[model samples]
Target: QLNALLSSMFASGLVDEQFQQLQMLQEDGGTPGFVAEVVTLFCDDADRIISELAALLDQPIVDFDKVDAYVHQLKGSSASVGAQKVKFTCMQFRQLCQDKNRDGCIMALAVVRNEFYDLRNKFQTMLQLEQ
Candidate 1:
């Protein structure tokens, strides 16, 4: 089933071989797993940051800097964990925020939000299998 999961991830472009590097590090069975630990942190951080972004963007005059900060955090963490889909969405999200395009930003936000959730689901499933 690991093969199936990995194939799905690659086929969907959700992750790349960088994620395999994370997995190989775990295979040594030395310390606690880096991928799972970092991914768990990313999940928690992403949730909190997403909430902050919603609050900031909902303001009458959006704080683009604040939103950008959260996006930057999300993007970096996602990339570290090989969340390609979320990272890609965030790349576009950054531009929309930079342009101060409220509608475009909101649309991009929705896309990244979905991407994050999808990433969360996949990682959770993979972790469950590890346990």
Candidate 2:
């Protein structure tokens, strides 16, 4: 059942093989919850970063550099968590930021936010299954 859920998630593009690689690492060296631990950290980090993005991006004069920095962190975290959609969105987001396209960044932000929540919900369900 768990495998089916995970497979569906991958099939949905909500995750990737990188997530399976993370699952594989969970039992390494007799340790467990490594993926969950890292995921929790990523979740915490994402919350703060996303909040900062909202505040930073809301400014009258958008700071592309700062926006880029926060998005960069998010990009890394999303990649680490195998958040395929969010990571993919961040790719376009970064370019839009670098290009100083306000409208594009705004749209990307919305996409990122939506994808983040969707991915987080899946993680919540997955973790529940673990329990």
lDDT of each: 0.83, 0.85
Highest lDDT scorer: 2
What are the runs in model 1 whose C-alpha is more than 4 Å off?
none
- Give the least accurate 10-residue stretch of model 1, judged by summed lDDT: 26-35
Candidate 2 TM-score to native: 0.91
lDDT (10s digit) by residue, model 1, range 6-108: 6798788888878878877876778586767888998998888888887787889998887887899988888887888888878887678778988887887
In candidate 2 the C-alpha lDDT for residue 77 amounts to: 96
Assess every candidate by TM-score: 0.92, 0.91
lDDT by residue (tens digit), candidate 2, 42-121: 78887788889888888999889998988989999999989988888888976687689988988888898998888888
